[PDB]
Amino acid sequence: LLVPKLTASVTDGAVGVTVDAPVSVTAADGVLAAVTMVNDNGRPVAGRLSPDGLRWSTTEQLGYNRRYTLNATALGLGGAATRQLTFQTSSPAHLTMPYVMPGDGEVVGVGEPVAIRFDENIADRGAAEKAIKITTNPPVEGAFYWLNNREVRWRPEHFWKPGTAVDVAVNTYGVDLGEGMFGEDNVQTHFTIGDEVIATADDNTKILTVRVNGEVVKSMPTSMGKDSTPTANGIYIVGSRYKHIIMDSSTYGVPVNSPNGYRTDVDWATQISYSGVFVHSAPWSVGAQGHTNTSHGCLNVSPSNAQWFYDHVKRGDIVEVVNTVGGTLPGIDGLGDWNIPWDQWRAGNAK
Ligand SMILES: *C(=O)[C@@H](C1=N[C@H](C(=O)O)[C@H](SCC(=O)OCCC)[C@@H]1C)[C@@H](C)O
């Protein structure tokens, strides 16, 4: 008769054991009679033994910088076997917490990229991407692209199809993100794509036309950026919306007391770039709207049209500006992702 065999997922004396996966023990030619795992302090980890008694596994999160001791005994018809193993888990120099947008259970527009922002610079971008699992339904090709050292975005080639489920599991706990930086925790979010809403601002007509699934539902006279501070052409993703907000030029780099500086309270503001472009209420320019550009770059519209926009446009909806004397909105603006050519985005920039 054969003596029971014990196999563990870790080796006695191991160091740098990653904590992204459970620790397990398996018996062969017998079953597991006793398994305990204990940290340096003496506290048990505990986990669960399978019903057939063949596999034990931890069931809670294992900690960084721990010395664990595993003790296991297997019993079989042919006798007994016991083993003791001590190992040390990863010791991070730093932890980083990821933050994901959009919010869990949200419904968003067809332009919304998956956004994962880390609170620390990521030295190994590849390791981060590999730890992020995106499920789409219906399935669609997409890719990762970094806007800066901390935030990565994922999107398809073209605007999402309405009705698409998107699931984002950021599995960075126990993952080495480079230079001793490990993930502080896992995060998980899920969202759904809603109606196709695209609003086009044509500088030739100075009308902002809102299309819902192809049909015009609103036509808003607008005043865009005056020639000296023009509105950039391109595709903008709708971000946050505000019943009212103080626009502070210093937020976007420009001292208030300077020529292009400003600090003004405005109503019904919908953000469409990080660089500070908003659709908002502009009572002072209702006579210019539909005729001449007078703003610092914002899409000035009437109070009721700004409120309409606030009520009817959602995060991830699309604003496209065309035929202005500006250039093109930067691809790495923060809400300019769609202006990056697919061949470039798809190639990514992890290295
Ligand atoms: C957008 O253009 C910016 C924001 N909107 C405006 C604007 O009218 O362009 C303000 S300036 C308002 C001002 O100087 O006096 C208040 C009424 C005339 C501000 C510049 C920013 C967020 O891009």
Swiss-Prot record:
It is found in: Cell membrane. GO terms for cellular component: plasma membrane. Pathway: Cell wall biogenesis; peptidoglycan biosynthesis. The active site is at 280 (proton donor/acceptor), 298 (nucleophile). Transmembrane segments: none annotated. Keywords: Acyltransferase, Calcium, Cell membrane, Cell shape, Cell wall biogenesis/degradation, Lipoprotein, Membrane, Metal-binding, Palmitate, Peptidoglycan synthesis, Signal, Transferase. It is a lipid-anchor. The record marks 298 as: Binds to carbapenem drug (covalent). Residues 197-322 form the L,D-TPase catalytic domain. The peptidoglycan structure of stationary-phase M.tuberculosis is atypical since it contains a majority (80%) of 3->3 cross-links synthesized by L,D-transpeptidases that predominate over the 4->3 cross-links formed by the D,D-transpeptidase activity of classical penicillin-binding proteins. In fact, 3-3 cross-linkages predominate throughout all growth phases and the ratio of 4-3/3-3 linkages does not vary significantly under any growth condition. Generates 3->3 cross-links in peptidoglycan, catalyzing the cleavage of the mDap(3)-D-Ala(4) bond of a tetrapeptide donor stem and the formation of a bond between the carbonyl of mDap(3) of the donor stem and the side chain of mDap(3) of the acceptor stem. Is specific for donor substrates containing a stem tetrapeptide since it cannot use pentapeptide stems. Consists of two tandem immunoglobulin-like Big_5 domains in the N-terminal region (residues 56-145 and 150-250), followed by a L,D-transpeptidase catalytic domain (residues 251-378) and a C-terminal tail (residues 379-408). This is L,D-transpeptidase 2. It comes from Mycobacterium tuberculosis (strain ATCC 25618 / H37Rv). The gene is ldtB.
